Scaffold this active site. Structure first.
Site, short mmCIF file in Angstrom:
data_model
loop_
_atom_site.label_atom_id
_atom_site.label_comp_id
_atom_site.label_asym_id
_atom_site.label_seq_id
_atom_site.Cartn_x
_atom_site.Cartn_y
_atom_site.Cartn_z
CD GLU A 37 -3.16 -0.65 -0.03
OE1 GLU A 37 -3.14 0.48 -0.52
OE2 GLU A 37 -3.99 -1.52 -0.35
CG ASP A 96 -6.38 5.92 -1.22
OD1 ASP A 96 -7.51 5.96 -0.78
OD2 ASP A 96 -6.09 5.58 -2.38
CG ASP A 130 -13.55 8.89 -5.43
OD1 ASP A 130 -12.47 9.36 -5.06
OD2 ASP A 130 -14.23 8.12 -4.73
CB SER A 171 -11.50 10.03 -2.21
OG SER A 171 -11.26 8.92 -3.05
CG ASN A 227 -10.81 6.29 -0.12
OD1 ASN A 227 -10.84 7.51 -0.22
ND2 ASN A 227 -11.29 5.49 -1.06
CG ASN A 260 -8.50 7.13 -4.38
OD1 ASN A 260 -8.84 7.25 -3.19
ND2 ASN A 260 -7.51 6.35 -4.75
#
Ligand SMILES: [Cl-]
Ligand SMILES: [Cl-]
Ligand code: NA
Length: 129
Positions: A35, A52, A48, A50, A59, A46
């Site tokens: 990750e 992380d 959209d 958003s 998220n 992301n």
């Protein structure tokens, strides 16, 4: 902070992640590796809009507030910046809530694709725990 593998394992063990909801410590180390490459300061945006955050790439769509994900929840009740600390407590406490929510570690796409069904005990091999 960029953790070493065993360093992170020990930290996660101290914070109660070993066998948390049935997931051995190896699963958590494997997830953090793919990750974030064990870097507490990792961020990724992301599609959209958003973002992380941190060692487990939590998220902002659901779990934390970054002030710029309109319509998002803050289910761990933390600023996302807290997830970027050298101290993993906030990341670990939030992860426990995520992993409890019904989907287990399938919440982490890198876990599902890179850790699930592999020999995850390899990730803690050698470590003094
Ligand atoms: Cl393990
Ligand atoms: Cl992946
Ligand atoms: Na820590």
């Amino acid at each position: 902070k960029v953790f070493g593998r065993c360093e992170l394992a020990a930290a996660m063990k101290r914070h109660g992640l070993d066998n948390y909801r049935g997931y051995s410590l190896g699963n958590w180390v494997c997830a953090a590796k793919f990750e974030s490459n064990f870097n507490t300061q990792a961020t990724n945006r992301n599609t959209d809009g958003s973002t992380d955050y941190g060692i487990l790439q939590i998220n902002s769509r659901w779990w934390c507030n970054d002030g710029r994900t309109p319509g998002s929840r803050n289910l761990c009740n933390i600023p996302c910046s807290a997830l970027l600390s050298s101290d993993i407590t906030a990341s670990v406490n939030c992860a426990k809530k995520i992993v409890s929510d019904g989907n287990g570690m399938n919440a982490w796409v890198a876990w599902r694709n890179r850790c699930k069904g592999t020999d995850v005990q390899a990730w803690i091999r050698g470590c003094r725990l």
